[PDB]
Symmetry: D3
Subunit: 66 residues, 6 copies
């Protein structure tokens, strides 16, 4: 929704989005999306869900990128 996005970009809440706030916001979103993708990928490799990739989980991932 238009209103919430505005409030999030407007960090100093003065009701004017500056160029610097736009730039910060775009960088922040890009960072968040890249971190989300990497976690999604990690969780896909970590079959047994324990937070680590063992050598057998790894080996399976690696043969399968084909």
């Amino acid at each position: 929704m238009a209103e919430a996005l505005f409030k999030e970009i407007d960090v100093n809440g003065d009701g004017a989005v500056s160029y610097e706030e736009v730039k910060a916001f775009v960088s922040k979103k890009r960072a968040i999306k890249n971190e989300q993708l990497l976690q999604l990928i990690f969780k896909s490799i970590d079959k047994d869900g324990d937070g680590f990739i063992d050598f057998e989980e790894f080996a399976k991932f690696y043969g399968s990128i084909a």
Copy 2:
């Protein structure tokens, strides 16, 4: 023109472009392009040209993309 393009990369003026000067140039050019693009987008949203994006301007922009 040839000299001018070389001089732009050769930031310490020694008449030779080092590998670090190439890397720095490739970064600077990419950063300039991204600034230019972002500034252009910004200016397109900033309908009254006052250097800031107000909620009204922001709603008009959000609405006309999706």
Copy 3:
């Protein structure tokens, strides 16, 4: 192979790949690839192999973009 790669990624040598480890490795590898490509490009201009592009080399390159 998978083995060597697992070892490379497992920087702390504890036999497990952590998410922090995956992040480090992805950043490392991205950086290496960029550096390889920029080196390959630089080497193709640096015709005498001395580690600098001189103006003559530059003009041979600027001259040839066809």
Copy 4:
């Protein structure tokens, strides 16, 4: 909003987002973005707003970029 977003990827209105609709939505969204950008760029070069870039306009623009 999750419904708004869902209802948009779900092109055929069957309440199910297929893999093909994901792939199409991703492509569509990429296309629209690029077109919008190219529109802005063009407009920025076409100072007099006549719908064409003349060599005078192209020359200015070739200045900065």
Copy 5:
């Protein structure tokens, strides 16, 4: 070292890799990688494995990306 990859690129078996063979290979590999990634994302959201994202599954996804 490199033999399997060279043979995979060298599609006509002449013991040479041509520019067109390299190009066809790079495109082929890029197409498969983009497919594997998008499939991975899809599958992570399709929790019941039925090949569709239903509204519950999607809301869990979109909610989970904050």
Copy 6:
């Protein structure tokens, strides 16, 4: 140079660059730039300049990046 560029973009030769012309050109130039880069890489691997990569050239390249 600029006029050479402008004339190249002005496909219909009417002295004006249209929006359709700009679109046509961006796709063209994108394609050209991607070919040019792949070409530069290829040429760097093809040490003997016969226009083909033989196995000993390929192995050398592969080793250099491994």
